[PDB]
Scaffold this active site. Structure first.
Site, PDB file in Angstrom:
ATOM      1  N   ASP A  14     -65.454  48.030 -19.812  1.00 50.54           N
ATOM      2  CA  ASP A  14     -64.738  47.082 -19.764  1.00 50.54           C
ATOM      3  C   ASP A  14     -63.888  46.773 -21.350  1.00 50.54           C
ATOM      4  O   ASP A  14     -65.270  46.014 -21.859  1.00 50.54           O
ATOM      5  CB  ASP A  14     -65.351  46.042 -18.826  1.00 50.54           C
ATOM      6  N   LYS A  58     -71.487  47.551 -15.894  1.00 49.49           N
ATOM      7  CA  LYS A  58     -70.062  47.019 -16.524  1.00 49.49           C
ATOM      8  C   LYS A  58     -70.518  46.867 -18.032  1.00 49.49           C
ATOM      9  O   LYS A  58     -71.552  45.999 -18.178  1.00 49.49           O
ATOM     10  CB  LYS A  58     -69.441  46.166 -16.137  1.00 49.49           C
ATOM     11  N   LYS A  86     -60.929  46.389 -22.924  1.00 45.50           N
ATOM     12  CA  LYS A  86     -59.450  45.981 -22.314  1.00 45.50           C
ATOM     13  C   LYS A  86     -58.826  46.380 -23.522  1.00 45.50           C
ATOM     14  O   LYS A  86     -58.069  45.316 -24.108  1.00 45.50           O
ATOM     15  CB  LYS A  86     -59.558  44.572 -22.680  1.00 45.50           C
ATOM     16  N   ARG A 139     -73.920  37.230 -13.976  1.00 46.17           N
ATOM     17  CA  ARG A 139     -74.982  36.122 -14.436  1.00 46.17           C
ATOM     18  C   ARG A 139     -75.448  35.690 -13.135  1.00 46.17           C
ATOM     19  O   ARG A 139     -76.786  36.200 -12.563  1.00 46.17           O
ATOM     20  CB  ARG A 139     -74.500  34.889 -14.993  1.00 46.17           C
ATOM     21  N   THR A 193     -59.012  36.049 -16.537  1.00 43.27           N
ATOM     22  CA  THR A 193     -59.477  34.809 -15.436  1.00 43.27           C
ATOM     23  C   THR A 193     -59.014  33.330 -16.396  1.00 43.27           C
ATOM     24  O   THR A 193     -58.755  32.801 -15.092  1.00 43.27           O
ATOM     25  CB  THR A 193     -60.729  35.302 -15.199  1.00 43.27           C
ATOM     26  N   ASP A 226     -53.478  48.004 -27.824  1.00 42.29           N
ATOM     27  CA  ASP A 226     -52.757  48.790 -29.237  1.00 42.29           C
ATOM     28  C   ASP A 226     -51.224  49.472 -28.842  1.00 42.29           C
ATOM     29  O   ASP A 226     -51.278  49.368 -28.230  1.00 42.29           O
ATOM     30  CB  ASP A 226     -54.366  49.423 -29.668  1.00 42.29           C
TER      31      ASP A 226
END
Lengths: 219, 218
Positions: free
Chosen positions: B60, B33, B62, B199, B120, B65
């Site tokens: 990714d 990603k 997002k 991570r 999230t 618009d």
């Protein structure tokens, strides 16, 4: 550094064409807006290509992410040296605060940080699908007030709302018009607009230099 | 092509550090990603570099618009050849429909088109400032149903909501977790199709060994 409030929208799909327009005009006469299409195609090197030609640049990517990621994205735009960068107020107060805080170390190199409130394409029926029942204008005002509270530099706002917004949010809070939908540029300036994005009327004119000169002669 | 549902997030601030990690892993073991930070820094050439190394890529960014602009950006992602791209469902139905239409000429080589519903990081108190009085989960469910109605491929969804979403939206509608608790095995059991992990892999002591431990459970 130009004294014109005009920002010309570069919505080309091709590098050569875009730069064939940009060499015809002069950094003294306008700034430039780089949006999603050109940035996805060409990345930050295109912005560097505009800087090397003497232009200041509004990086119009409308970042909308979690606070840390938006912070890192705005800092990246600041490292690229852009003059203005925007985020969605719909990302919320903490995301807006994180972006502002990521830019404070840049001091005088920091770009102007502007929030999109409601996009021009959103009518009441688009908003109701999302649970928003305020009118576009009332929702925009709400998001603009949230933006000011978070300390951002201004909002994207139609000229039709600029007197309202200057009265409610103050002369210092910057208003940028989005270049899509009546007011002439001169009348939009009279309304309090600080920067006006202009796209097709300049880039699709037979003489964009004389068009841009005519717009500037009125401001 | 990989059978793993894992997508590892590349959130480095330096190309050399990112590619050093990518050189250690293998495209058979995961997809990758590329998010806002790496893309703003390096642009599409970084995606091309990952493709040249054999990986499939979730771009990714997002996109959020006006319809025509989101559509052109999604088409640009398709031209770049990515495996998955995402947009905000908050951009509304007409925006999502425009993005769907932009990918039709790419046919079966199109990226999967996935919508972000609620981030999230958003809690109820964050939504209230925006006029939204639903819980994050209920607002996400409303935006997910809108995404399905617009004909997109799937949504970003926590594993805690995957059972609900598979029941309500069907097996064909793809669920992608953001990786921002349920284990990868439990997430897969709940119906998650693709899982983003960041991570926990990239900052682990031995990222190849971590990734192998995750894939063995799946």
């Amino acid at each position: 550094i130009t004294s014109s409030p005009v920002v010309v929208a570069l919505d080309y799909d091709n590098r050569d064409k875009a730069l064939a327009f940009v060499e015809r005009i002069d950094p003294r006469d306008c700034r430039l807006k780089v949006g999603k299409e050109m940035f996805t195609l060409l990345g930050p090197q295109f912005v560097r290509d505009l800087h090397q030609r003497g232009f200041e640049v509004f990086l119009d990517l409308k970042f909308h992410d979690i606070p840390n990621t938006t912070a890192r994205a705005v800092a990246a735009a600041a490292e690229l040296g852009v003059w203005m960068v925007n985020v969605h107020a719909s990302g919320g107060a903490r995301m807006m605060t994180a972006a502002r805080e990521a830019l404070l170390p840049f001091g005088k190199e920091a770009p102007l940080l502007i929030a999109v409130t409601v996009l021009t394409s959103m009518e009441a029926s688009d908003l109701q699908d999302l649970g928003i029942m305020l009118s576009p204008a009332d929702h925009a005002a709400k998001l603009a007030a949230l933006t000011k509270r978070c300390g951002l530099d201004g909002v994207v706002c139609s000229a039709q709302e600029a007197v309202r917004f200057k009265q409610e949010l103050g002369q210092e809070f910057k208003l940028v018009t989005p270049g899509i939908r009546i007011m002439t540029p001169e009348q939009a300036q009279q309304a309090g607009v600080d920067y006006m994005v202009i796209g097709r009327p300049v880039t699709q004119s037979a003489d964009p230099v004389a068009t841009l000169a005519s717009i500037n002669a009125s401001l």
